[PDB]
Design a protein around this nucleic acid. Structure first.
Length: 290
DNA sequence: GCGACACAGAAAC
DNA sequence: AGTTTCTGTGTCGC
């Protein structure tokens, strides 16, 4: 009925089938680690400006809500929230040095303005993109939006428990406790330590996230979850690390820059989940029908 | 099958 | 210790 796995930090993931067991909306049992991510590929090389040394990059993603491991499949629910978090790391560069240097794409060298992550959902069988939607905590009483590109600096991925604890914090004191985990405030550094060309100072905003946290995410309400044969569709969640450049034959998405001009999110690395099943609104997907 | 509204119960304070 | 917030899901009606 409930299958329990121990997480890396000592919390548990408790997998249950909502067709058989109804658990309260805010139960800690709704929090669990989802499927592991796998490398899809590496794309454009990045090199430090003078040394010419190649920056080796690694996406560090995890799903902390919305997916259960049920008899050999990973299962989500159309109507319910999932959480996908990600950082990236640079194995061969400490953060403090990284922020002070400058980086080019090796395509022929385009200056990297900043690094960022975006997420996508796909039909895993045909590579078709599927829309994702996010809400605020107010849900229907607030706006819905599509996941945005998240400027980010390299950082360890917080433990599952930390993502849990930070999920619905209002109180100012607790916010302060978690600030340094999720944000770098560029306006608080010593500006004299940095060259005008430094990477830190080509980020678009002073408040820079250390962790991309996509919470209250759902597949669009219009997705069909079954194939015509009534077999389940297979979906997959993708995380892409990119370098944003000023575009004045390699994979990239256009990005609406801060100054207004047309920018380029140039792909560096992409990871994805194994196939995912999503259960629709059918009453037979719920324990209430029994 | 989908948008909207409603109820419920644990978290957050 | 009580109030409000958040989120899984029951339900209506088109």
């Amino acid at each position: 009925v409930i299958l329990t796995q121990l997480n890396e930090d000592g919390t548990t993931s408790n997998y249950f089938d909502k067709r058989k067991l109804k658990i309260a909306p805010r139960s800690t049992l709704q929090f669990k680690v989802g499927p592991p991510f796998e490398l899809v590929r590496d794309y454009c090389p990045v090199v430090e400006s003078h040394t010419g040394r190649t920056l080796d990059l690694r996406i560090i993603p995890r799903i902390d809500r919305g997916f259960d491991h049920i008899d050999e499949e990973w299962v989500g629910y159309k109507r319910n929230y999932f959480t996908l978090v990600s950082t990236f790391e640079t194995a061969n560069c400490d953060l403090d040095t990284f922020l002070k240097s400058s980086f080019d794409l090796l395509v022929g060298r385009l200056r990297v303005q900043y690094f960022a992550i975006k997420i996508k959902a796909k039909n895993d069988d045909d590579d078709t993109e599927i829309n994702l939607v996010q809400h605020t905590a107010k849900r229907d009483k607030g706006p819905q939006f599509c996941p945005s590109v998240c400027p980010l600096v390299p950082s360890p991925l917080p433990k599952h428990q930390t993502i849990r604890e930070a999920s619905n914090v209002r109180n100012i004191t607790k916010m302060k406790k978690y600030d340094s985990t999720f944000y770098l405030h560029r306006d608080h550094v010593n500006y004299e330590e940095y060259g005008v060309d430094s990477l830190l100072f080509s980020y678009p905003e002073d408040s820079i996230q250390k962790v991309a946290r996509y919470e209250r995410v759902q597949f669009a309400s219009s997705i069909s979850v079954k194939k015509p044969s009534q077999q389940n569709k297979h979906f997959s969640l993708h995380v892409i690390l990119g370098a944003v450049v000023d575009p004045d034959g390699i994979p990239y998405d256009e990005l609406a820059l801060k100054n207004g001009s047309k920018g380029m999110f140039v792909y560096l690395q992409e990871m994805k989940t194994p196939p995912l099943i999503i259960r629709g609104r059918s009453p037979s997907n719920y324990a209430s029908s029994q």
